Design a protein around this ligand. Structure first.
Ligand SMILES: Nc1ncnc2c1ncn2[C@@H]1O[C@H](COP(=O)(O)OP(=O)(O)OP(=O)(O)O)[C@@H](O)[C@H]1O
Ligand SMILES: [Mg+2]
Length: 416
């Protein structure tokens, strides 16, 4: 089904005005972009249009959290228009707004081959459907305003293209409110749909899921859904201490413990068993006397237990050995969440070693998929983004898909 959605390559842009939703939510150290990766990732879709005859390409995105109020001094997309021109090697007309008669006029019949970038969509409360006033109060959008906001956006072009997977899990105007005949996913969206269709529809075997992170209670449905698709599962990160404490009665000191999740642990292992899923848990760890980068370090195993006032921040060598064996047997892998506190070098090794194994697995034909967020951040930090099959551009959106939910933005796209 995820494979039945219209994509840019199967769309005729020749001589048509293109309205395209992109992800330009780049990090800014102030008024300077600290990372332009998101802008670069979007170029292939924009260039495809320009090279295939499109009359124009109207770009709309959001940045930061203006919360439905205009804040051009902090979250304006003006800096992005400048970075865009240098990357595309073409001129970019930047408009101070994204809707209105003045914007609609400038988009009615643009100079052929024109690239237009609209101002932050979230300056208007109608994009998210909700926001906050300067008083800090919470305000809800007016349905009549929402309708006019959506009809406006719909006049800026002839065909709609969505390349912002990271926002697909939200029913925002720019995601589900553009009323045009054909709505196709861009090339970035295409990659996300193809790879996750592999994770949820027709996966290769064995299929291994590597789950990490801090909490358990918030990943219950994710684990539940994955247990219905995988053959093996690694449960790492701070999440594993809740499992180890419950199943082995292991002493975990000050390590993270998920009270609510602890009551569901045995029920998750039961389903695993009923499905024939093999679960791999850590067996040793790297401990710390405090939750800090420069903390004193130690070691522990499941048998020895973790000392009082100490916490496990990473898996140890024996756990890395077992993890690597799991990866060795997999023909398909989906990795979501670090297996340790990767933000601090002293506790990032378990995760770095696993990445090295997954990169090696990819070389021999394993399909390796990394989820958005932290995991996706690990790839940029150690330059392996091009060493795996796919690195998701959307953390939360990718998480909702793995949970088995239908994404509003993906659903709005045209079929076949
Ligand atoms: N053993 C551990 N003890 C404590 N924290 C850990 C441990 N292993 C990993 N973490 C932390 O878990 C975090 C990732 O958790 P998770 O995947 O739940 O995060 P997220 O939902 O994407 O974001 P947030 O952390 O903001 O909720 C990382 O920042 C990492 O440092
Ligand atoms: Mg979170």
């Amino acid at each position: 089904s995820l494979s039945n959605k219209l994509t840019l390559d199967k769309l005729d842009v020749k001589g048509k005005r293109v309205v395209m939703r992109v992800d330009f939510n780049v990090p800014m150290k102030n008024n300077q972009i600290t990372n332009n990766q998101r802008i670069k990732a979007a170029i292939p879709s924009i260039k495809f249009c320009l090279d295939n005859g499109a009359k124009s390409v109207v770009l709309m995105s959001h940045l930061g959290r203006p919360d439905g109020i205009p804040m051009p001094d902090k979250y304006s997309l003006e800096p992005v228009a400048v970075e865009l021109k240098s990357l595309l090697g073409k001129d970019v007309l930047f408009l101070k707004d994204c809707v209105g008669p003045e914007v609609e006029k400038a988009c009615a019949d643009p100079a052929a081959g024109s690239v237009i970038l609209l101002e932050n969509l979230r300056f208007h409360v109608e994009e998210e459907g909700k926001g906050k006033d300067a008083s800090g109060s919470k305000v809800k959008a007016d349905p009549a305003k929402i309708e006019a906001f959506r009809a406006s956006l719909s006049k800026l072009g002839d065909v709609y293209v969505n390349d912002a997977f990271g926002t697909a899990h939200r029913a925002h105007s720019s995601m589900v409110g553009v009323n045009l005949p054909k709505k196709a996913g861009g090339f970035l969206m295409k990659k996300e749909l193809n790879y996750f269709a592999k994770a949820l529809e027709s996966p290769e075997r064995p299929f291994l899921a590597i789950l990490g992170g801090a909490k358990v209670a918030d990943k219950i449905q994710l684990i539940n859904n994955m247990l219905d698709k995988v053959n093996e599962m690694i449960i790492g990160g701070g999440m594993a201490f809740t499992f180890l404490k419950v199943l082995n009665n292991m002493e975990i000191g000050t390590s993270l413990f998920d009270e609510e999740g602890s009551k569901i642990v045995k029920d998750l292992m039961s389903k695993a068993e009923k499905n024939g899923v093999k679960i791999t848990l850590p067996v040793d760890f790297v401990t710390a006397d405090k939750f800090d980068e420069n903390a004193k370090t130690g070691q522990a195993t499941v048998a020895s237990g973790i000392p009082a006032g100490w916490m496990g921040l990473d898996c140890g060598p024996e756990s890395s050995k077992k993890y690597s064996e799991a990866v060795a047997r997999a023909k398909q892998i989906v990795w979501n969440g670090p297996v340790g506190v990767f933000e601090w070098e002293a506790f990032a090794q378990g995760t770095k070693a696993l990445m090295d194994e997954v990169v090696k697995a990819t070389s021999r034909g394993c399909i390796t998929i990394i989820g958005g967020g932290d995991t996706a951040t690990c790839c940029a930090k150690w330059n392996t983004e091009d060493k795996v099959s796919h690195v998701s551009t959307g953390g939360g959106a990718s998480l909702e898909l793995l949970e088995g939910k239908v994404l509003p933005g993906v659903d709005a796209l045209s079929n076949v």
